[model samples]
Target: SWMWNQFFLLEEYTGSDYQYVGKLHSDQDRGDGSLKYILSGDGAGDLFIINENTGDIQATKRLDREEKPVYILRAQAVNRRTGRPVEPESEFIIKIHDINDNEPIFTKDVYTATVPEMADVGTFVVQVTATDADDPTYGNSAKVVYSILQGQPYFSVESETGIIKTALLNMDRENREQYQVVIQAKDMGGQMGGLSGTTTVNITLTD
Candidate 1:
């Protein structure tokens, strides 16, 4: 019987080297001992071989991410002794997947501050801190932007840093009591794909 399958590599990778570590299954019986395999490409020489019967193929060394986004590896089963292609030949493929291993966490999970009533338009009320788990040298992954969601009034936020300030003052704590504001933080690079997280701040007025 013949076998067929399609493998897809990630569109982008986070680390400098992407690793494809997994197992593959087949319908036809290979042989008694094992089958020899070969992978071809510009970096084919660096490819590592494993026992097809056991289904173990790992990267012997790291692969440069800038080299290529995807690779087409054609694996063949051949006789160990004769060095000839095994009967009822079979082909398999391998692909790499990306993960959100990066951590762009906020310096503070929750913020507590106050904005006095009748404050100026540009008055600085509070400042929030956050950082990216990825290397700052990348620039993209290290960069962070902050913004406020719609339907929120009486406040404004900084685009670069998470600094929330009062847009219009004279807020009455007795009438509104307090405000529950949601601040969003997102990464500028990596596989996060514009992924973001939020924190809540409680604001109250004082005499």
Candidate 2:
């Protein structure tokens, strides 16, 4: 007897009682009430629990996908009276789904960059970086968009990337040698209510 595939459960589930995960069953068992189900693996009975009589599984505690991505467990069906194995132990997986529970963070609170005074528009300046703890595979929870809050008319940022580039050309360094650019990083494609973080970039125009 064998089990099919893995199951998926959302992370940070809140309920009055344990959340029901999924069921495990063996094809060799006849439902005559003679087979007992047992679960064995890391954190078995601690992180997860199963009913020996029905093979119903439940999560005992809240789950975080960033902490642990997946949980593997082995299921076995044994004779209730003889305690002998009725089916081969089968391995299964429980994958934790992700949510936008974390905010984006900039690599540094402040950055320093330099560009030539006569640099052309879209000239390379410096790249800013930010990180999000949410999963990038499932949804847009980790999709970050970069925006320039300050330094307009002089500098701009790539929306998809964190790159900072020149927005204007032919500037005199003596007029303004230094400028402060505020960059913002927002998760969830920078949609409304998305988590955001900001950083300051001190740029100097070089001759």
Candidate 2 residue-wise lDDT, 1-207, digit = tens:
565578899999989899889998887668888999999997689999999988999999999999998998898889978978988888889999998998889999999989888877899999999999999997789999999899887788999899999986455344787889999999999999899999999888899
TM agreement with the true structure for every prediction: 0.49, 0.90
lDDT of each: 0.58, 0.89
Off by over 4 Å in 1: 1-100, 171-174, 189-192
TM-score, cand. 1 vs. native = 0.49
In candidate 1, position 161 carries an lDDT of 72
Clashes of 2: 0
